[PDB]
Design a protein around this ligand. Sequence first.
Ligand code: NA
Length: 773
Amino acid sequence: MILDTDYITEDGKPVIRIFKKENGEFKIDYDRNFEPYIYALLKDDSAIEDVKKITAERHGTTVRVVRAEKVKKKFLGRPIEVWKLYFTHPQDQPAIRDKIKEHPAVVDIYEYDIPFAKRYLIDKGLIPMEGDEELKMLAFDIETLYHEGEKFAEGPILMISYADEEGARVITWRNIDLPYVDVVSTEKEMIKRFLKVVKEKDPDVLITYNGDNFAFAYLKKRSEKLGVKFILGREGSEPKIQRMGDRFAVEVKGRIHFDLYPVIRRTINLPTYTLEAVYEAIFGQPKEKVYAEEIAQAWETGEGLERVARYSMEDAKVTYELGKEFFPMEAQLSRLVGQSLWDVSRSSTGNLVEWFLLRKAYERNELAPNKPDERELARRRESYAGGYVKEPERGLWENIVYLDFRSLYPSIIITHNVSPDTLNREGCEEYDVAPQVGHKFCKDFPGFIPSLLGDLLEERQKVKKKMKATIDPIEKKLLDYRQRAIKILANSFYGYYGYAKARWYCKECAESVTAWGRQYIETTIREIEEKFGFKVLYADTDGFFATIPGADAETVKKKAKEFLDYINAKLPGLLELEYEGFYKRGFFVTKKKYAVIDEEDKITTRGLEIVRRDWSEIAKETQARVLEAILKHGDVEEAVRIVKEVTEKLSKYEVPPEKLVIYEQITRDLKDYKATGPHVAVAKRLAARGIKIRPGTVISYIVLKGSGRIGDRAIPFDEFDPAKHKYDAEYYIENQVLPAVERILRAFGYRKEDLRYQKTRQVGLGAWLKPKT
Ligand code: NA
């Protein structure tokens, strides 16, 4: 299977390199005969004799148009006649692009900034990550000590941990006695040992969590200060830092650097993205997290060293296991899009759509529109819209169905043939009209994009059919990824239409699709209320919740399903409502804020759970028990009672100290946070122990009863002693606990004031001590 492609240049001539894993053997194929090209639209064919003779200068060398041929292609829904201009080198294109574009007979140029190594996969019909071939993978992570008044990576790396099929290990130059740890002399010998272990395992895949921004950069800058030759690429390469938006990305030649961070960020949503918050979500097993203070404590002192080595080991093992989860999925997308997994895993959804369109465009002989220049980009970016919402019926309700459209936006696009190439066309005989915005989309001929979508939705269905028919759970699992990759791509098309960097950009398309979305949601709701006597409790563009008042669980289920058959016979084309679930109880606060409980006693929440950086167990626990009281027990008053009890217990210092640890991933150095707040005080307590915390790591502190502002006395949690230390109850009540339950309970009629007992050490600072939203 094809892992990746690039090119090298040999005496000014480009050579495509194709990295392959076949029958357990890595190799590199070469293609010396792949020619770069662009297209040009001319006013009169006679002008090509001028174009053929245009030259520019690259480093003293005259760059020329090597060859031209006329080709018929489709563009903008209609035939176009263009000129294919061949070159020697892909880098000749920009230099000569500017000149050719100033020729009065040249209307414009096309497909001139499509990377050569990618052009190659498209044109040759090649697809990465195909076939059976198994791949050896290996995760790694590093532990570092931080210096505040310094440059990047001045502090040494103390630990390099890795994880394989064979297990996990830690390399270090501190004195530690554990089975899985190998000890060495220096940091230099540690790094060298890591390079030696990688080079000999020969992984096809290097897995990291955030290695694009931390691990690799750190490893290079340290090798640089220490004089170590940082070779990890198969063909003798130091890994190359690459310009990836605002931040960076690292490539390793011959291997695939699978950085887990962008994948997880683009997969499942969360507040703080700790390696530990992620292993929680997708596995259900607790972290065993040791915080940043405990480990920098082990660096100077040496106490708690074996616990750090366990932690470091666990970073690796988790990183590996997380990698075994996300890889096949990302291998499917890279297979579906036609681009390397390295690219595909770091791409935005809009950009994944672009690469998919480009390749299909090649197969259909469709000329691709250019990107926007600086002026168009700003003009596109300066667009906002609103959204649909049916504001909720307040309160607690029972026997709730949840109904959603099957692929709302893809359906609209296919059914109404919504495409830049079908927009307000001239002399059109069949057109649908967009609601609100009034655009006319032609149906005389299928749009380029609509038809590709059509085929995607149909392929998904076929794959799903085969998944459910397949008894073999290996093939079953694989088909399931296949199916789910189609979903991710299909559902990206709507975004892409309004995606400012998009080649087939079409704001008119975007807003039309949004408007038809509203209409279908709107008329379906009107119909469920009038024809079927339901009460719609809440509605999004992700679907709606409804019940029949005074009907039991199975009347509602039967009627909803009867309603589906009724509207699905009345909805146009591919538009189709589905049964998404049932919930015995639920309540709805506002747009995308709600909690519901299904028949398995499982609470699903939306826009409600704690998304602050500085969180604690006492807040989470108390919120959980409120939602539990309302939804499990059907008791709103118990919920209010519980909060009153919890706040009382806090007042009287009966809440166990451990539940009051505030975990916060720090956004910069602690020594320079907002003057007021617990941060400065934690920084002094840590400095006195000779510790500094790296921005981007999670600290642990408890807030104590103090002599200044409430919240300004806070200590490291390991420093806590039940005598000589009292915690600041008012801080846990007004900053932590109340804010976690105020929104939920306001929806039921309760004010902040109703959530404490009449006299329980009230300090009237709620408005100040609350987090500024
Ligand atoms: Na689905």
